[PDB]
Design a protein around this ligand. Structure first.
Ligand SMILES: *[C@@H]1O[C@H](CO)[C@@H](O[C@@H]2O[C@H](CO)[C@@H](O[C@H]3O[C@H](CO)[C@@H](O)[C@H](O)[C@@H]3O)[C@H](O)[C@H]2NC(C)=O)[C@H](O)[C@H]1NC(C)=O
Ligand SMILES: *[C@@H]1O[C@H](CO)[C@@H](O[C@@H]2O[C@H](CO)[C@@H](O)[C@H](O)[C@H]2NC(C)=O)[C@H](O)[C@H]1NC(C)=O
Ligand SMILES: CCCCCCCCCO[C@@H]1O[C@H](CO)[C@@H](O)[C@H](O)[C@H]1O
Ligand SMILES: CCCCCCCCCO[C@@H]1O[C@H](CO)[C@@H](O)[C@H](O)[C@H]1O
Ligand SMILES: CCCCCCCCCO[C@@H]1O[C@H](CO)[C@@H](O)[C@H](O)[C@H]1O
Ligand SMILES: CCCCCCCCCO[C@@H]1O[C@H](CO)[C@@H](O)[C@H](O)[C@H]1O
Ligand SMILES: CCCCCCCCCO[C@@H]1O[C@H](CO)[C@@H](O)[C@H](O)[C@H]1O
Ligand SMILES: *C/C=C(C)/C=C\C=C(C)\C=C\C1=C(C)CCCC1(C)C
Ligand SMILES: *C(=O)CCCCCCCCCCCCCCC
Ligand SMILES: *C(=O)CCCCCCCCCCCCCCC
Ligand SMILES: [Hg+2]
Ligand SMILES: [Hg+2]
Ligand SMILES: [Hg+2]
Ligand SMILES: [Zn+2]
Ligand SMILES: [Zn+2]
Ligand SMILES: [Zn+2]
Ligand SMILES: [Zn+2]
Length: 340
């Protein structure tokens, strides 16, 4: 056997030498060198070191500025939270797992590590659909009289959590399971083994379709529609606001792909080539790189959203003067209203 199937795992190493041992009981320093694990640990450390402040700042800004309530703002507050969950929930176990060379915290660590990462990634994807739509509406303006409100915005957010849980929760209660991957320092869905007793084959197919293919079709298609009204370029007069948001949304989507296709692909590969000969590094990279998903979103947001940015610059300066080049939102100052 090219691998080493446990009743709990599958080390992509061969135990014709007895050196293979549970990623739940002892260091996997036989799969790779003790420094590569240190690198992982370093990286993860940096990720936590960054995913925390960025996602938190975003949180504090969004709420502290009472007018920042557009769907987009909602979605992003959402992502900021899901990102924070990743950070403490799983990133902590993954940093640790790396530090020790295996899941010292047992299958729970594997679960915290795998779950929150999937919970985080899916919320990201599903939010992307909520946006795709919100966008399609505000640009192709379907209803004669319409403009999303916080009431709908909260709907979409609640929805992304349901859809996300719909994907990430099952492996915790019987459908498929979270299992260490690569150098056994992160945990993902079981593609490696058939394990009739947990129905991996079915869930994986389920996830790839319901929680990957479909949303993508939806998002891509909705894009194919808005490739007419808000065609592509950038720089009423309100036209220039929505068209700039879209551009961001679009980027966000590309950003998502770069962060997940390499992984999703490696995952799909394995699923359809279980027992074949792949090593530990084969998954560690797309899997850990993928972990940037807990942080890139806010960056796009602060870089491509002139309103939020200046709002952050505002909070950061505890007062004003946000070095920009247009409406507002804040607290004591003029976060007053202007409806109709
Ligand atoms: C790869 O093959 C190895 C042997 O061919 C095998 O190692 C075996 O590991 C077990 C640990 O569970 C050792 O047994 C020990 O069991 C209990 C732990 O629950 C200890 O308290 C006892 O002291 C006992 O020694 C075996 O000694 C060891 N087999 C050997 C070297 O003879 C690996 O588990 C195999 N890799 C896999 C499939 O994970
Ligand atoms: C062990 O791993 C090797 C490497 O993949 C597997 O060998 C492949 O076998 C398939 C059919 O069994 C051939 O079509 C390929 O040419 C072989 N190499 C590949 C996939 O590139 C072997 O089957 C694996 N044995 C198992 C299932 O444990
Ligand atoms: C695309 C940018 C155009 C902004 C339109 C999106 C609506 C979200 C912000 O609206 C404002 O929210 C305040 C608190 O929620 C209300 O007090 C105020 O009356 C309302 O106008
Ligand atoms: C984090 C993900 C990185 C985002 C990807 C950035 C690529 C977007 C810029 O592309 C360019 O945009 C112009 C205006 O639309 C087009 O005229 C041009 O042909 C196209 O090449
Ligand atoms: C990690 C996220 C950073 C990637 C940047 C995405 C590439 C798209 C750049 O488009 C430009 O962005 C400017 C933001 O200032 C807008 O003013 C301008 O109109 C728009 O055309
Ligand atoms: C969409 C981007 C994601 C990339 C997709 C990852 C699949 C690439 C893996 O290829 C396989 O690697 C094995 C070695 O491990 C070879 O033995 C095998 O012949 C080769 O076919
Ligand atoms: C995506 C890139 C494709 C690479 C995936 C295959 C993993 C190759 C690394 O294997 C490891 O190399 C060490 C040094 O030789 C050995 O000590 C160790 O036992 C072995 O497991
Ligand atoms: C740090 C640990 C990781 C990478 C664990 C789990 C990740 C997944 C099970 C990924 C699932 C998917 C996402 C988030 C993006 C769309 C495709 C997907 C279903 C493969
Ligand atoms: C305004 O008074 C002048 C600008 C000074 C503020 C800029 C300082 C950099 C802020 C870094 C962001 C870290 C936030 C930490 C969140 C936990
Ligand atoms: C409102 O909340 C206060 C405004 C923020 C004050 C700006 C402080 C930035 C930190 C600058 C420190 C200079 C670096 C010196 C190296 C020791
Ligand atoms: Hg769209
Ligand atoms: Hg990324
Ligand atoms: Hg602002
Ligand atoms: Zn899902
Ligand atoms: Zn299978
Ligand atoms: Zn990837
Ligand atoms: Zn500016």
């Amino acid at each position: 056997m090219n691998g080493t199937e446990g009743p709990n795992f599958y080390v992509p190493f061969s135990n014709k030498t007895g050196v293979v041992r549970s990623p739940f009981e002892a260091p996997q320093y036989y799969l790779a060198e003790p420094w590569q694990f240190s690198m992982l640990a370093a990286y993860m450390f940096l990720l936590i070191m960054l995913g925390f402040p960025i996602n938190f700042l975003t949180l504090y800004v969004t709420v502290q500025h009472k007018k920042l309530r557009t769907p987009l703002n909602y979605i992003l507050l959402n992502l900021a939270v899901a990102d924070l969950f990743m950070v403490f929930g799983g990133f902590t176990t993954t940093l640790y797992t790396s530090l020790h060379g295996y899941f010292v915290f047992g299958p729970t660590g594997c679960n915290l590590e795998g779950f929150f990462a999937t919970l985080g990634g899916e919320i990201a994807l599903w939010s992307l659909v909520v946006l795709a739509i919100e966008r399609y509406v505000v640009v192709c303006k379907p209803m004669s009289n319409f403009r999303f409100g916080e009431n709908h915005a909260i709907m979409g957010v609640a929805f992304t959590w349901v859809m996300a849980l719909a994907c990430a929760a099952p492996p915790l209660v019987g459908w498929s399971r979270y299992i260490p991957e690569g150098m056994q320092c992160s945990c993902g869905i079981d593609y490696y083994t058939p394990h009739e007793e947990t129905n991996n084959e079915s869930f994986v197919i389920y996830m790839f379709v319901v929680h990957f293919i479909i949303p993508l079709i939806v998002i891509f298609f909705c894009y194919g529609q808005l490739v007419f009204t808000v065609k592509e370029a950038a720089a009423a007069t309100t036209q220039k606001a929505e068209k700039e948001v879209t551009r961001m949304v679009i980027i966000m989507v590309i950003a998502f792909l770069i962060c997940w296709l390499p992984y999703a692909g490696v995952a799909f590969y394995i699923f359809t080539h279980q027992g074949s000969d792949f090593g530990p590094i084969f998954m560690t990279i797309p899997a850990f790189f993928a972990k940037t998903s807990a942080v890139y979103n806010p960056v796009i947001y602060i870089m491509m959203n002139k309103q939020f940015r200046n709002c952050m610059v505002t909070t950061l300066c505890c007062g004003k003067n946000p070095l920009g080049d247009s409406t507002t939102v804040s607290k004591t100052e003029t976060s007053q209203v202007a409806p109709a």
